[PDB]
Design an enzyme around this catalytic site. Sequence first.
Site, PDB file in Angstrom:
ATOM      1  N   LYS A 178       0.825  -1.205   0.000  1.00 10.54           N
ATOM      2  CA  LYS A 178       0.000   0.000   0.000  1.00 10.54           C
ATOM      3  C   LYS A 178       0.861   1.258   0.000  1.00 10.54           C
ATOM      4  O   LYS A 178       0.618   2.191  -0.776  1.00 10.54           O
ATOM      5  CB  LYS A 178      -0.942  -0.006   1.205  1.00 10.54           C
ATOM      6  CG  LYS A 178      -1.737  -1.285   1.372  1.00 10.54           C
ATOM      7  CD  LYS A 178      -2.689  -1.190   2.550  1.00 10.54           C
ATOM      8  CE  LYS A 178      -1.938  -1.059   3.861  1.00 10.54           C
ATOM      9  NZ  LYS A 178      -1.229  -2.315   4.220  1.00 10.54           N
ATOM     10  N   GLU A 204       1.295   5.302  11.385  1.00 15.85           N
ATOM     11  CA  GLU A 204       2.222   4.608  10.502  1.00 15.85           C
ATOM     12  C   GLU A 204       3.636   4.697  11.068  1.00 15.85           C
ATOM     13  O   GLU A 204       3.866   5.242  12.150  1.00 15.85           O
ATOM     14  CB  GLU A 204       2.158   5.184   9.086  1.00 15.85           C
ATOM     15  CG  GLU A 204       1.099   4.538   8.214  1.00 15.85           C
ATOM     16  CD  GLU A 204       1.163   3.026   8.252  1.00 15.85           C
ATOM     17  OE1 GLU A 204       2.075   2.451   7.621  1.00 15.85           O
ATOM     18  OE2 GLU A 204       0.302   2.410   8.914  1.00 15.85           O
ATOM     19  N   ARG A 205       4.589   4.147  10.322  1.00 21.38           N
ATOM     20  CA  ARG A 205       5.964   4.078  10.791  1.00 21.38           C
ATOM     21  C   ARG A 205       6.595   5.464  10.856  1.00 21.38           C
ATOM     22  O   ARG A 205       6.285   6.354  10.060  1.00 21.38           O
ATOM     23  CB  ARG A 205       6.794   3.177   9.880  1.00 21.38           C
ATOM     24  CG  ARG A 205       6.323   1.740   9.829  1.00 21.38           C
ATOM     25  CD  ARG A 205       7.226   0.905   8.947  1.00 21.38           C
ATOM     26  NE  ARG A 205       6.805  -0.489   8.896  1.00 21.38           N
ATOM     27  CZ  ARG A 205       5.815  -0.944   8.142  1.00 21.38           C
ATOM     28  NH1 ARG A 205       5.112  -0.138   7.364  1.00 21.38           N
ATOM     29  NH2 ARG A 205       5.521  -2.239   8.171  1.00 21.38           N
TER      30      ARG A 205
HETATM   31  N1  LIG Z   1       5.910  -2.101  -6.616  1.00 15.20           N
HETATM   32  C1  LIG Z   1       6.719  -2.861  -5.870  1.00 15.20           C
HETATM   33  N2  LIG Z   1       7.862  -3.319  -6.425  1.00 15.20           N
HETATM   34  C2  LIG Z   1       8.675  -4.079  -5.688  1.00 15.20           C
HETATM   35  N3  LIG Z   1       8.529  -4.477  -4.422  1.00 15.20           N
HETATM   36  C3  LIG Z   1       7.392  -4.009  -3.898  1.00 15.20           C
HETATM   37  C4  LIG Z   1       6.452  -3.214  -4.533  1.00 15.20           C
HETATM   38  N4  LIG Z   1       5.399  -2.921  -3.680  1.00 15.20           N
HETATM   39  C5  LIG Z   1       5.721  -3.535  -2.568  1.00 15.20           C
HETATM   40  N5  LIG Z   1       6.912  -4.212  -2.627  1.00 15.20           N
HETATM   41  C6  LIG Z   1       7.540  -4.988  -1.563  1.00 15.20           C
HETATM   42  O1  LIG Z   1       6.623  -5.101  -0.487  1.00 15.20           O
HETATM   43  C7  LIG Z   1       7.202  -4.553   0.716  1.00 15.20           C
HETATM   44  C8  LIG Z   1       6.126  -3.900   1.545  1.00 15.20           C
HETATM   45  O2  LIG Z   1       5.659  -2.716   0.865  1.00 15.20           O
HETATM   46  P1  LIG Z   1       4.899  -1.571   1.641  1.00 15.20           P
HETATM   47  O3  LIG Z   1       5.788  -0.913   2.619  1.00 15.20           O
HETATM   48  O4  LIG Z   1       4.266  -0.633   0.616  1.00 15.20           O
HETATM   49  O5  LIG Z   1       3.712  -2.350   2.358  1.00 15.20           O
HETATM   50  P2  LIG Z   1       2.404  -1.971   3.182  1.00 15.20           P
HETATM   51  O6  LIG Z   1       1.190  -2.566   2.599  1.00 15.20           O
HETATM   52  O7  LIG Z   1       2.391  -0.453   3.342  1.00 15.20           O
HETATM   53  O8  LIG Z   1       2.729  -2.580   4.604  1.00 15.20           O
HETATM   54  P3  LIG Z   1       2.380  -2.339   6.141  1.00 15.20           P
HETATM   55  O9  LIG Z   1       1.089  -3.125   6.369  1.00 15.20           O
HETATM   56  O10 LIG Z   1       3.511  -2.774   7.007  1.00 15.20           O
HETATM   57  O11 LIG Z   1       2.072  -0.843   6.236  1.00 15.20           O
HETATM   58  C9  LIG Z   1       8.303  -3.622   0.226  1.00 15.20           C
HETATM   59  O12 LIG Z   1       9.319  -3.465   1.208  1.00 15.20           O
HETATM   60  C10 LIG Z   1       8.823  -4.360  -1.008  1.00 15.20           C
HETATM   61  O13 LIG Z   1       9.763  -5.370  -0.659  1.00 15.20           O
HETATM   62 MG   LIG Z   2       2.121   0.945   4.801  1.00 14.46          MG
END
Ligand SMILES: Nc1ncnc2c1ncn2[C@@H]1O[C@H](COP(=O)(O)OP(=O)(O)OP(=O)(O)O)[C@@H](O)[C@H]1O
Ligand SMILES: [Mg+2]
Lengths: 498, 48
Positions: A178, A204-205
């Site tokens: 996300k 968030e972080r």
């Molecule tokens: N477009 C992308 N290309 C490559 N890797 C990706 C991509 N999107 C996500 N990732 C991988 O997924 C990981 C998590 O992505 P992200 O930080 O956006 O997650 P999130 O859904 O915000 O997580 P959280 O629930 O912890 O907030 C990244 O560190 C990366 O390794």
């Molecule tokens: Mg996130």
Amino acid sequence: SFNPTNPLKPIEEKEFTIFGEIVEIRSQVYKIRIDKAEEEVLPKVIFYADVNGKEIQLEVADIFDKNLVSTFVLGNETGLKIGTKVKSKNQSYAIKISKRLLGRVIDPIGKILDDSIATPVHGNMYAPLEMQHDSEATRYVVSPKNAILETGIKVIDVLLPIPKGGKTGLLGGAGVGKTVIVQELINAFIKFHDGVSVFAGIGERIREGHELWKEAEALGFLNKTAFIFGQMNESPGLRFRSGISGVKVAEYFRNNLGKSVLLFMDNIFRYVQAGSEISSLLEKTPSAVGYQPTLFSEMGQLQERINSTKDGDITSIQAMYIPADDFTDPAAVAAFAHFDSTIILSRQLAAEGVYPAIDPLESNSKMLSIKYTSREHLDIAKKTVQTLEKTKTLEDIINILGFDALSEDDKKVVEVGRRLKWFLTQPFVVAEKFSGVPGKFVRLKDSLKGIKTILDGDLNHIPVSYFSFVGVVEEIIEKFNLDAKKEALKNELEQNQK
Amino acid sequence: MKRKDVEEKKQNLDFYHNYIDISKIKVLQKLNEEIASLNMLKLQKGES
Ligand SMILES: Nc1ncnc2c1ncn2[C@@H]1O[C@H](COP(=O)(O)OP(=O)(O)OP(=O)(O)O)[C@@H](O)[C@H]1O
Ligand SMILES: [Mg+2]
């Protein structure tokens, strides 16, 4: 110049008129008894206390009697004891807003978060909780959506168009992508936007907020962006007000300056979670799954203020967290009702390596209408989703009964579906740190042409592996042609040698 | 995770379980055809 028609009005000057002391304590929740008051206390007003020169604010929740109220802290509670003196102006919390907020990083209550010396922010005192308008009818003078933003992401641009002046949501579990998609949208929207931008971090972080602030400084769009940060290290009282403050800042920049605001919220689930925690701490009867009874009303109170009027547009891009990957969660159900575009991320797709891990068979967009796009775009999107659905159905037959049970049509359908699924993946500009593949920006007509070519069956000879993480289909064709040329040259060389 | 989805999955599994019996019947019939053809091919090979 610009003449505001519904401008925000700064708070009224007042003197402290209610005085009392803390008679019950707990974690994050305190009960105040009022000794002296020239007026009766109102809901949601703020009691201020000082401990060693540090100011602590407590928002009123319940009024049991004429003298006894319950409150929750907005910030850190360290220092509050039994008998701490509190005083109140019978007014809700306010923050300093002005054009000077752009490029400044603050928290929901206005504490400076970008330097140690705490450089003050000039402006007027506005109360985010107090929203003022002429009458209820005035809230119904809103503009219709008549535009679609281009993102450069193939799947979003083709199947899930994002409104301008509307609301889009990015739903998914933990660690599915996300934040990366939000950052990519920020990169692809700001610096080309005729207006300002407001970012609201909600639970968030800290590292992500620091990274985003540094990126905003480095790429030059910091001075066009206002940052608000109530993060996951903050109390429930602060995570509950980040979205309200962000919406108030966007409303100031729209109503008072006639600007178009790009509003980013992440993560919008933490607002609901903090409200649930506050409700649980005040000992109210829980709803299903132990949520607060006022969940839908709380979501609406924040989401209905993000509207588009004749003064300008407020475009909202929001990230929604799904606890335990349960998409029937009451918070998700409440949030589904407000998103004009809904983009649902899948953990299985991310595990397979599909990035972005967008599930087009679970997502939907209300911008896929004849009022906003052409006939050809609608036809291409519908055909793509239909082919993906048929391929998903056929994959189970392939998995269980083997491959030879299919017909010639079913096999061609599966090949087209696999090529379509792997063509929608794309390398993100912000995602260069993860791998190193340079980012690509594909415009809408190139995406439509590529999807039409793949659907027609023109590229069934090219192996599926070539289709992953490219831009236009010309890159796939070039890679295939170069690999075939290298193979042919090697074969000719070895046959010359023999 | 609702009983509707579990019922759908179980009905798919039962349909596949029946279809495998149908496939067994079809494969047995094709095997009988192949053996019948092979007997004639053997006799033709001996005559040749
Ligand atoms: N477009 C992308 N290309 C490559 N890797 C990706 C991509 N999107 C996500 N990732 C991988 O997924 C990981 C998590 O992505 P992200 O930080 O956006 O997650 P999130 O859904 O915000 O997580 P959280 O629930 O912890 O907030 C990244 O560190 C990366 O390794
Ligand atoms: Mg996130």
